[PDB]
Amino acid sequence: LNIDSIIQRLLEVRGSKPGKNVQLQENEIRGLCLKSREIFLSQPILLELEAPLKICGDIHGQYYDLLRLFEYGGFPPESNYLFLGDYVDRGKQSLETICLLLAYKIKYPENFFLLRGNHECASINRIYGFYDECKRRYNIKLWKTFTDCFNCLPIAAIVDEKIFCCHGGLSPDLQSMEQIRRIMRPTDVPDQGLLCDLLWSDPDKDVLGWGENDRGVSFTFGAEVVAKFLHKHDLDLICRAHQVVEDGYEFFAKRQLVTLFSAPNYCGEFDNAGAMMSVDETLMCSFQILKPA
């Protein structure tokens, strides 16, 4: 597995008319999956990270936008990165997107981090594009290899004991961080419970405590739940992704929670910028916005 060669081939399209494919060999992609899987299992399921770092929300196969985000934020290892999940589905180039991200995880294992999103799950990415993309360009066996890899992704991160990061949101089940640590991998995403909620829940201004989530999975949670969670755990901020937000980032509950969504003009359907949150060594957080003309 020649990681430098793989990265070079993936990045060769930075100067191309957008939309061009990069077709790695199937065995190379299998190698990315297998080596990254080993690394994910060797690191905690609840990551403990230190600033400075840049935190990104959903990418959803918008590969050229990922390249634009790295151009703005600095390509690894110039900046340390934490991604909050949702690398695949919806966009046209899930394969290039996840291959570049896994390649960077292998190249910079202590400076580059990927969390699990709700789309890094076979039952979801079977229907929202990734299975079809794998079948068309490669084969179903490759899709199953990705599934085995995704089943090993970590599911939350805490930055400097102050910023709690996950793809979806809080869970009524989450009382102690050790509950996250005790989750064994590989695992699928269950249809309910703590891991499900960390990938699926959403904040809601109209909910008192915990409420219905009309995704048909997990819960909504209100501002008071956020405040109580932060106070209980001596945290300052929840950083999550999972919903399109017009400006690329959006605060909730008097800046106690922020949503990041990093795929601009999502699906060619939404009027949104993408953003990442840059966290400096003092935990001063800034938003770098990638905005379509």
């Binding site: 100067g15 008319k17 957008p18 390249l67 634009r68 935990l283 800034s286 905005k291």
Partner: protein
């Protein structure tokens, strides 16, 4: 002790969807300590 604070707004990096990823239309602001 470290505590979360928020920095000044940064002007966006503006891009044209039809242009290469290595040629942004306008460079966005970058944070400094």
């Amino acid at each position: 002790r470290k505590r979360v604070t928020f920095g000044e707004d940064l002007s966006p990096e503006v891009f044209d969807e039809s242009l290469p990823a290595n040629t942004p239309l306008r460079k966005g602001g970058t944070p400094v300590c």
